[PDB]
C-alpha cells in the first residue's frame, strides 16, 4: 500500500460539508474549508475550490482531487522546513508516508516541534523514536491514529494498516 490508502484509513470521508468536532467546517478526506462559523462561508470557499455551485455536496472525484492536493501540500511543507526535510530525505518510503501523515494531521510546524523524535528518526533509532513519540499530547488526543503511525515508524512496515475492518458509523 501507500500514503494515499494510509490516510484514507486515518482520515475518513465526507461528500457533504461537515462541522467537525474542533468547530471547523470540513469536507472530503479531512479537507479544511474555513475556520469561520458561517456555513455560507464554507460554501463560498468550497464553490471557489471546485469551480461550481455545489450547495455543499461534492463527488468522489472532487474529494480525491482535494485529497491529492492536500497530500502534495504536506510534502511541500516538509521540504520547506529545516527540521523536517533532512529527516524526510533520510527515511525510506514507508516511514516517509508516516511523516506525511503527521503533517497532514497537524501541519509542518506542529510536526517540526517533535524535536527529539525527529532526531531519533534521522539517526535510525526506531524503538526510542516510538517511545518518544508516544509521550506526546498528539498521542493522548488521537491515540488510535498515533499508534498506527508510530508503529509504521517503528517497523518500517505496513502492518498497523493491514487487516483492519470497518464497523459502520456511517455510509
Ligand X SMILES: *[C@@H]1O[C@H](CO)[C@@H](O)[C@H](O)[C@H]1NC(=O)CCCCCCC(C)C
168 binding another protein? (CB under 8 A) = yes
**What sign has the CA pseudo-torsion 140, 166, 96, 20?**
negative
Distance between CA atoms of residues 121 and 116, nearest Å? 9
CB of 166 to ligand X, least distance (A): 3
For ligand X, which residue of 25, 67, 104, 114 counts as binding (CB under 6 A)? 67
Phi-psi category of 16—alpha, beta or left, where left has phi over 0 and alpha has psi -120 to 50? Answer: beta
CB of 108 to Cl ion, least distance (A): 9
Site for ligand NAG in 79-108 (CB under 6 A): none
145 binding another protein? (CB under 8 A) = no
* Residue 64 interface partner, choices ligand X, Cl ion, another protein, none, CB cut-off 5-8 Å depending on type: ligand X
| Per-residue cell: 132 | 518518544
For ligand X, which residue of 64, 81, 106, 156 counts as binding (CB under 6 A)? 64
Q: Are 92 and 156 in contact (CB under 8 A)?
A: yes
For ligand X, which residue of 60, 76, 80, 135 counts as binding (CB under 6 A)? 60
16 binding ligand X? (CB under 6 A) = no
| Per-residue cell: 81 | 522546513
User: Scanning the structure block, which residue is given the C-alpha cell 456555513?
Assistant: 39
| Per-residue cell: 92 | 525510506
15 binding another protein? (CB under 8 A) = yes
Q: How many CB atoms lie within 10 A of CB 162?
A: 8
Active site residue 108: no
Active site residue 45: no
Q: Would you please indicate which residues are annotated as catalytic (active-site) residues? A: 11, 20
Binding site for ligand NAG (CB under 6 A): 10-12, 167, 169
Amino acid at each position: 500500500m501507500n500514503i494515499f490508502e494510509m490516510l484514507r484509513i486515518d482520515e475518513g470521508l465526507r461528500l457533504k460539508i461537515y462541522k467537525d468536532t474542533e468547530g471547523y467546517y470540513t469536507i472530503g478526506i479531512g479537507h479544511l474549508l474555513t475556520k469561520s462559523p458561517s456555513l455560507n462561508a464554507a460554501k463560498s470557499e468550497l464553490d471557489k475550490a471546485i469551480g461550481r455551485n455545489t450547495n455543499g455536496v461534492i463527488t468522489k472525484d472532487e474529494a480525491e482531487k482535494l485529497f491529492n492536493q492536500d497530500v502534495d501540500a504536506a510534502v511541500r511543507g516538509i521540504l520547506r522546513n529545516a527540521k523536517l526535510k533532512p529527516v524526510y530525505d533520510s527515511l525510506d518510503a514507508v516511514r516517509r508516508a508516516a511523516l506525511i501523515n503527521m503533517v497532514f494531521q497537524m501541519g509542518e510546524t506542529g510536526v517540526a516541534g517533535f524535536t527529539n523524535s525527529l532526531r531519533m528518526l534521522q539517526q535510525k533509532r526506531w524503538d526510542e523514536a516510538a517511545v518518544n513519540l508516544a509521550k506526546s499530547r498528539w498521542y493522548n488526543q488521537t491515540p488510535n491514529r498515533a499508534k498506527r503511525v508510530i508503529t509504521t515508524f517503528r517497523t518500517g512496515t505496513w502492518d498497523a494498516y493491514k487487516n483492519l475492518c470497518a464497523h459502520x458509523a456511517x455510509x
